[PDB]
Amino acid sequence: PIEYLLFEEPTGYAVFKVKLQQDDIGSRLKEVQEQINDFGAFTKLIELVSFAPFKGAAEALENANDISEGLVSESLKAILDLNLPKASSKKKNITLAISDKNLGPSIKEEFPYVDCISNELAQDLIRGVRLHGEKLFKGLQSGDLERAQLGLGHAYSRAKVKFSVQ
Amino acid sequence: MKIKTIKRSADDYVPVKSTQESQMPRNLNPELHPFERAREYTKALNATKLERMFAKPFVGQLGYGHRDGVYAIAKNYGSLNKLATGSADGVIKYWNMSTREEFVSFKAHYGLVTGLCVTQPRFHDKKPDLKSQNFMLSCSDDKTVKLWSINVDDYSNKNNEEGLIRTFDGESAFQGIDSHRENSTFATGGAKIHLWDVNRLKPVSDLSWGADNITSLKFNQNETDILASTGSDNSIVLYDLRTNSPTQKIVQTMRTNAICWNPMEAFNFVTANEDHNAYYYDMRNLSRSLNVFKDHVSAVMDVDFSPTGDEIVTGSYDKSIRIYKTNHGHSREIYHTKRMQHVFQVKYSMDSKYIISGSDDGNVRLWRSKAWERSNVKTTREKNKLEYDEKLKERFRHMPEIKRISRHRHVPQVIKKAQEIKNIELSSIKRREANERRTRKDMPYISERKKQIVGTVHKYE
Amino acid sequence: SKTRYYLEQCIPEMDDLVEKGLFTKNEVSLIMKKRTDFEHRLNSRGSSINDYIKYINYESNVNKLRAKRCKRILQVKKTNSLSDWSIQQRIGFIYQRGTNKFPQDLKFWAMYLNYMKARGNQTSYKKIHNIYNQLLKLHPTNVDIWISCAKYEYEVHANFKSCRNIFQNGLRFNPDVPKLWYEYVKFELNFITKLINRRKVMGLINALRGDIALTIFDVCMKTLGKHYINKHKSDSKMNIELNKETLNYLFSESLRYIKLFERDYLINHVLQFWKNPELYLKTVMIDITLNIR
Amino acid sequence: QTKDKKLRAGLKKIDEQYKKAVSSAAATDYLLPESNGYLEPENELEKTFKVQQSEIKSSVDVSTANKALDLSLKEFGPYHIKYAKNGTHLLITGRKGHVASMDWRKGQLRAELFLNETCHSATYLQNEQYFAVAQKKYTFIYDHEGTELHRLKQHIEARHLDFLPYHYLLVTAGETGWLKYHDVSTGQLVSELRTKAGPTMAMAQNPWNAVMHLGHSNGTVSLWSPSMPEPLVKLLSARGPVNSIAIDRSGYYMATTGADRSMKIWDIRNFKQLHSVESLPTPGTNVSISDTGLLALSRGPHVTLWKDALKLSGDSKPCFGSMGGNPHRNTPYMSHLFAGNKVENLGFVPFEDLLGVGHQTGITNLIVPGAGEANYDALELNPFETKKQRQEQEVRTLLNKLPADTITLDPNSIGSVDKRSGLRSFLRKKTQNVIDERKLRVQKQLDKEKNIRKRNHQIDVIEEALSRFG
Amino acid sequence: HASAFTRTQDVPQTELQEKVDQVLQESNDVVAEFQEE
């Protein structure tokens, strides 16, 4: 019961709809771990649904800072509001797989009909998505992830340190 | 003189591109595909050979185990990772089976842990978080019942109160436990079965035929107010909770160790019984067993229904596990290891895929329900081929070659020898009975399904 | 394989089509040769939107030929058959497959939408909704798509509340698009004028109105300035320079609003907001021209 | 039908499942890829057998005109022709030493062998790669390039070998009167059956059934299977010897030609000879069946083709000349006669419509409008095979090869049901003997009791007066 | 199942939403051997 997952990226947020569930007990087995590595089987387990790209470098930077501190940004708020179905706020909440335990509560207190998950299974799904990366986007236009990462890392670190031209 | 011949367009058959996939014309003309029976027979025979060379049951064990043999297992009927095991040491653990790890490990009681239930209470003081914590209920031999909390990582949705929420003192030594679902109401069989509520420290209701202790209990899955119980004057007693009273009683020739309803029929149960057998009963007509499951060689110790409702898994005091289908009456499959002994508890998994077995060498192993079905996701082509395999071998199941191959399973020498001895004794009984029949006049043809009931209380017709 | 699945799924309507006297065995067989070619080209790797498009085009021409054939050979507008909707069902199936394989191609998405809307007689209001939901989810930062969906809804059903919500969401994703804000204001004014004309017609048979658009302008103003600063955000000289440039940009936008534009009142409001050099000169000459008007 | 609800439901469910299956097969038929080719008059004055191969080549497609080979090898003996089951490679065996295996369409000579040993016949066995030839003495198995892979020694004097492809089995009937099934994958002579008859004259395989029809000198066809050492069945076809026998692809009809100028069409699946063409001016050298029920006869300088002769109608009976064009008479579909050659044999091209004849000069294909089956089935035989598909499919068939003994007279017989120290040793022998005798005595006593039971189921003045004294 | 059209939570999430909502609220031979065999 892992209906959706959220994946943050240097160029914006992505949201995937889980199609099948890998069996929960067998997860430590050679066979399911290999299907996470392989690309053919990961597509059977996951299809992308949404992708909101960041506006510019500054907006990406502050968004990464808020992800670090564990808050929800305006952009994340919007994309979740758009993708996630509205179930009853009392029974049958919708399951979303995130990467950060500390991100959980903020998402909840913004969306009381969603339930975050960071399990062994959800961490495996995040890992597979991160491994395959751009092949999963079916061609949706994304910046070069590696250059994005270099720029973002440098900006993040300079921000924390207070690097100065003086 | 209008004529034409077979002309092929190589453009149509051999594609212009290189990546484009050439087409495969098909013609279902029967005279074009010549051998049906022989071809399909050999496909089925190869299929069973492959089954035999792919049967790899054992999938792994749960951490380092228990110190002193496992005697209580309780799966969480809600989730799928979680089970709770308990040992004659007195130490109960709450396992995460996805990682083969343990959440906690409480030293619960001074004596044995005789029962475990896993649940969520319905407190009236508050509503304990069903999402951050699970709850567990141990039923001990030193006259106590304890309710524990477990911190479970299932959801990531918060950020104290770790263990032993509550303790229920008893007057007797408790001997089995189960918890009526969707009501938060448990029932414990010691010297007289008590219906307890979570919020009251005094047993709410007394249910007992007479003055006999009660070995074990189990509620049923559907129509959930029907409880069944097994007592040590080798009796099986159905209770109902809406009228709040015992309902009926059957007495067999030997004590029944455990009972499981089935979760798809709601009035059938199956009892693991010490005369090496498992008897499958209808509830409304308790005079006779629907079926008898046979192939054990020492006391059967536990049974469980697959949630699909069609298979049974039994574990005996002989050191092996057997899997049965509800309609046959002989073992589909036998699981056995040199390192597993006196299977005392068996639980079949809520995805129907696996089997957990607690054994008194102190270990909680877990096995595959069908020894083939790898857990990975299968491409549609492969999936179709596998389902085709299964259909073909179900079709040709009884041909002598295929039967020889797919029934050859290796069994420990103790079980082989015990089985041939038991066959000898049954032949002996049967032919002395034959001679007695040859002479005497009046002996009933006592049926194989009524042979095993000493007597019922409420006689009907 | 999967091609075999698709071809056999195509068989029964072919059976019906030959059964009714409007396609001969040979013609139908030729049709299937072409079908199989297309099916393998889609299924095999390396396929492309051009292949999906050509497949659609071929099927559409088959549909037209079938329609004219039934018009001529038996002079019936519509046979009560299986085929008559089967071909369009297969076209819809092709569109869905193509978009699930290449969710990048705006041109293909738009062909899909044009087809479905134009055939909208038998289609689903709900189906247009689903297509638009999926598209918007995939490409949230395409103000073109947001505007197109809003305009379709307002022009076809005129669900003013639904169009309003669409614009709200579109802004929530893209506060940076003055084109989007512009179109939102245009929709606001059109709705206002339609309502007032309805009031006029009720009067025939037997201002907060501006202020809504005023508020929209104010918040557009504020957030556009914000995001223009955020791009190219370091001392007093660059602070003043960026302030000047964003003032230039943003007041050019306000000039566009003036061009878009009762009318005197709204322009007036724009003028007071603006007051709150050469730009001052332009404002005051705008004032005198307004007084002329 | 029986008056039981449960059995009515069962048989109705099963029958309708069968009907669903066959309706699906018919839909596939609408989906077929191609169409057979034909030859019809349009008129009454002119007749089909009057057309000429030059006329056909002029009037038809260039690919087919190119495909209609004509090889002349006037050096070595008359040539014996075989096409691969795939329908692509051709294999010619001259009478003196010439053996060639050629791709036949792109004209790649796969292999050429010059043997002075008088070869007789040959066959690709399992692919285009391995092929077997006869010799003066032994049988030889050859690789694709032509290197001697094996010299099968036990197959002595092997005139008429043939390979049956689901069981992977090589059958080498010859002259001492002897028939040997040689499993070619595992390489072990599966079976070795003597024929009491004599030097087997002709031989052909029933493929619906995979049973070998030999044709002896008595005039008897005999149907053999590799399991048991007696003929499954025997038929008396003609008098004198039986020159040739050919079998429909459905294994339903057979044609036999015997040197007493006789020709027979037989219903194999019921063993009633449909009819007997006796008006035959010269003994028939050869006979073959196409894939579309088209009968080719060869009298040595002549080849004649009868369409639709394999049916049960009286009109089906083939003739050679009709007076006044009587419609109820079956004139030959299409004729041809060579100049002076003697057709060594003839075989149809599997998936085109050509029949290749081998004669004293060499090989000639005649374009027949409706001979071969236009639309094949990729899962079985691809005229187009990339090397990887071919090898993969080879391993596939190798896995699923049927067992040798499955060959029987009725290919469905698999399914049914039936319900199938010193003193110590000495004293041990005594006591075991005692236990045995004890068992026999108990048996006999039980039997007396049962016999009395059956009796109780089936149930003079002085003698009356004295009943009670015995 | 959430769409892009309907206001989901029915509570404003931006200054645009709240402002416009409150404004709109205000505005309301051979034979022989064969025989023998």
Swiss-Prot record, chain A:
It comes from the Eukaryota. It is found in: Nucleus, Nucleolus. Interacts with NOP1 and NOP58. Component of the ribosomal small subunit (SSU) processome composed of at least 40 protein subunits and snoRNA U3. Present with 13500 molecules/cell in log phase SD medium. Belongs to the NOP5/NOP56 family. Required for 60S ribosomal subunit synthesis. This is Nucleolar protein 56. It comes from Saccharomyces cerevisiae (strain ATCC 204508 / S288c) (Baker's yeast).
Curated annotation (Swiss-Prot), chain B:
GO terms for cellular component: 90S preribosome; nucleolus; nucleoplasm; small-subunit processome. InterPro entries: G-protein_beta_WD-40_rep, Sof1, WD40/YVTN_repeat-like_dom_sf, WD40_repeat_dom_sf, WD40_rpt, WD_repeat_DCAF13/WDSOF1. Coiled coil: none annotated. Residues 432-451 have a biased composition (Basic and acidic residues). Residues 432-461 are annotated as: Disordered. WD repeats lie at residues 65-105, 113-158, 169-206, 209-249, 251-291, 295-334, 338-377. Its main location: nucleus. It holds the Pfam family WD40. Keywords: Nucleus, Repeat, Ribonucleoprotein, Ribosome biogenesis, rRNA processing, WD repeat. It is found in: Nucleus, Nucleolus. GO terms for biological process: maturation of SSU-rRNA; maturation of SSU-rRNA from tricistronic rRNA transcript (SSU-rRNA, 5.8S rRNA, LSU-rRNA). The keyword Transit peptide does not apply. The keyword Nucleus applies. SMART domains: WD40. GO terms for molecular function: mRNA binding. Interacts with snoRNA U3. Interacts with NOP1 and MPP10. Component of the ribosomal small subunit (SSU) processome composed of at least 40 protein subunits and snoRNA U3. Present with 6620 molecules/cell in log phase SD medium. Required for ribosomal RNA processing. Belongs to the WD repeat DCAF13/WDSOF1 family. This is Protein SOF1.
Swiss-Prot record, chain D:
PANTHER family: WD REPEAT-CONTAINING PROTEIN 46 (PTHR14085:SF3), WD-REPEAT PROTEIN BING4 (PTHR14085). One of its GO terms (biological process) is endonucleolytic cleavage in 5'-ETS of tricistronic rRNA transcript (SSU-rRNA, 5.8S rRNA, LSU-rRNA). InterPro entries: BING4_C_dom (IPR012952), WD40/YVTN_repeat-like_dom_sf (IPR015943), WD40_repeat_CS (IPR019775), WD40_repeat_dom_sf (IPR036322), WD40_rpt (IPR001680), WDR46/Utp7 (IPR040315). This is U3 small nucleolar RNA-associated protein 7. Involved in nucleolar processing of pre-18S ribosomal RNA. Present with 5800 molecules/cell in log phase SD medium. The keyword Chloroplast does not apply. WD repeats lie at residues 73-114, 195-234, 237-276, 279-316.
UniProtKB/Swiss-Prot annotation, chain E:
It is found in: Nucleus, Nucleolus. Involved in nucleolar processing of pre-18S ribosomal RNA. Interacts with snoRNA U3. Interacts with MPP10. Component of the ribosomal small subunit (SSU) processome composed of at least 40 protein subunits and snoRNA U3. Present with 1470 molecules/cell in log phase SD medium. Belongs to the UTP14 family. This is U3 small nucleolar RNA-associated protein 14.
